[PDB]
Amino acid sequence: MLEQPYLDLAKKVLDEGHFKPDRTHTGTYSIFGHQMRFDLSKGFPLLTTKKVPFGLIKSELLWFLHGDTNIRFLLQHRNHIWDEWAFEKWVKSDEYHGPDMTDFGHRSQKDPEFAAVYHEEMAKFDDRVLHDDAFAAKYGDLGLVYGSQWRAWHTSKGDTIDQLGDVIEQIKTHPYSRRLIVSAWNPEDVPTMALPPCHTLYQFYVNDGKLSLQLYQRSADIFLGVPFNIASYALLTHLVAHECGLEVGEFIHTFGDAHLFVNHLDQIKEQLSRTPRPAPTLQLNPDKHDIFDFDMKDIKLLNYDPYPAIKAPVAV
Amino acid sequence: MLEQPYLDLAKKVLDEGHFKPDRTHTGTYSIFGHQMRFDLSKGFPLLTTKKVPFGLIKSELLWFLHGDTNIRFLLQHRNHIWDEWAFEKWVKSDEYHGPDMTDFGHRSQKDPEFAAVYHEEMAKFDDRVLHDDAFAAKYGDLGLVYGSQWRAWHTSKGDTIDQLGDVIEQIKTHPYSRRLIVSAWNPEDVPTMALPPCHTLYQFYVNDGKLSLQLYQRSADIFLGVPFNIASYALLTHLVAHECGLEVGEFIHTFGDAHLFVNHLDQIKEQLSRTPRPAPTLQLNPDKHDIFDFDMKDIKLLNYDPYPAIKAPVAV
Numbered sequence A, B: 001m002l003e004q005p006y007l008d009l010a011k012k013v014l015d016e017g018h019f020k021p022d023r024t025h026t027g028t029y030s031i032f033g034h035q036m037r038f039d040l041s042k043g044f045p046l047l048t049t050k051k052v053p054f055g056l057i058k059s060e061l062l063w064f065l066h067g068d069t070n071i072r073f074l075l076q077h078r079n080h081i082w083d084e085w086a087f088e089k090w091v092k093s094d095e096y097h098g099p100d101m102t103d104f105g106h107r108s109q110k111d112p113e114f115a116a117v118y119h120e121e122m123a124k125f126d127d128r129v130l131h132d133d134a135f136a137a138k139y140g141d142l143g144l145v146y147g148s149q150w151r152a153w154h155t156s157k158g159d160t161i162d163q164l165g166d167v168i169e170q171i172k173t174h175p176y177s178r179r180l181i182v183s184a185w186n187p188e189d190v191p192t193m194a195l196p197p198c199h200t201l202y203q204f205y206v207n208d209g210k211l212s213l214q215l216y217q218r219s220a221d222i223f224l225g226v227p228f229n230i231a232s233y234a235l236l237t238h239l240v241a242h243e244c245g246l247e248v249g250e251f252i253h254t255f256g257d258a259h260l261f262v263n264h265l266d267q268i269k270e271q272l273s274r275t276p277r278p279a280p281t282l283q284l285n286p287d288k289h290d291i292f293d294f295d296m297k298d299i300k301l302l303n304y305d306p307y308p309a310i311k312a313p314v315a316v
């Protein structure tokens, strides 16, 4: 079935992965170098063995595609995936006068009463970003995130490259090119960023009127992150193919370090006892062609019928 | 045997690859997305089923490691791999007064008498680069090649990052880091370079005192290029491990487009009828530790006993 490479990867980390501590205190089981593939003509690889919210994946991708780096657009589609990076900034600034919020990541899991003074400041941070333009401009804007890396890469001569829009143009006019590459990795920013990009680079490929895409992901959270990651680049391959008048090939997912947090063992083992269902179908607006101007309603998911969601703690 | 993944890859492109024309007129059989691995504790992956000149691979790597971008150092170790890119420049310049050399690449294979007016200008270009300092500075210097990308990446504020030397420092002090990445892909240079880097990015990984390395190669000439590529990054993994006091793990070779030129079919089919021998051993100077100051004599290859070389035409 379509998601099997994903369950094979989980099985593999389970009986083959090495114990390694990491950047936190939450241990991992870990492998290095892995490759899986999804034939997108066979259906859309949103996991059926656990419910994944597509509406989140689809509004985060549109954000990236519009070159946007401001949380505000996410909040308008009730997408909180990026709140913590914005909040971090607000909180560690002059204008902030409130409970001290230091190491709020850990301390939301070790104190149920703190976790409500945190969820309080956050709801107020989001509300302000939504209603106060100057505030949004100051704290809503992440700066270096996929929307500027893909669409507005800063040059040493002070201009701005649309990496992705140029490559789309190369696909239309030189389909056989071996240089259809978008990189998110800037050696000059990377030492001072809070999160150097996990999705480091990707490459497109055309053959027999079919578009394929390969992602090099340096670091992957197998239980929580990877199910989102897969759907996000599978959708990108679909949007680009649609823009270029091509059919869709394969999505190839290459990993550097793929890890399983040790507080996710039971959840993954439960998931492995489920039996994949038939994959959903993806449907794109036949009438609209500029993907840079796609909106929520231009992407529908059909026949998605998943097992229930599995709750897991985030790693500190 | 140690090189089997390489012969499996050739076999795969042969009966599974798609005919695709390319950037020249010389057709290819082509696949997209492939991964192979070499356990470097099992020996050094220099192909035994065809003679590969290690002395070339080893002087080209030292060049890169010294941050050098000047052909001159190559010529001193009689290494001509990079001559054509330098010559191209010389020839397409004001100071050049000689036979017109336009499309000299093609026209060295379609004219046996031209091919000797080309080999004449080239021997004179190399001799000058070797003896005339101002000339070397002007035409010997490639500018953007792996030695500056790895060791002297230009920032937008006019300084210069030693990407590789910083990452070596990260390996010594944060071995478990998921961000041990060296990129050669600069979105601002790539549209104006004659050859955007084939070796796009690589990532190191440590576990149980062992160093592994994964290469993302966007485009690979399977018959001619890949045997050099493999040995070159396998040696890098060895030099870095030696510098950091680690043992050596695996070299993981990931491909975007891996192609076989159609004028290489007979040669590859002949190679596939050979039987791999035991792999050579690599030996590094036990007393010298700064790889940035390694020289030819600091790297020895032991027990390399290959089948004869197989002659093939370069693709135009």
Ligand SMILES: O=c1ccn([C@H]2C[C@H](O)[C@@H](COP(=O)(O)O)O2)c(=O)[nH]1
Residues within 6 Å of the ligand: A023, A195, A196, A198, A219, A220, A221, A222, A224, A225, A226, A228, A229, B178, B179
């Ligand atoms: O879309 C995402 C975003 C994040 N991660 C995870 C992987 C790691 O657990 C963490 C990054 O930490 P470092 O790898 O930088 O150390 O983020 C994913 O798998 N997918």
Ligand SMILES: O=c1ccn([C@H]2C[C@H](O)[C@@H](COP(=O)(O)O)O2)c(=O)[nH]1
Residues within 6 Å of the ligand: A178, A179, B023, B195, B196, B198, B219, B220, B221, B222, B224, B225, B226, B228, B229
């Ligand atoms: O070390 C090398 C250097 C070059 N190539 C080849 C692969 C391609 O045939 C060619 C690059 O052309 P483009 O891929 O940029 O189109 O160089 C290799 O395989 N290994």
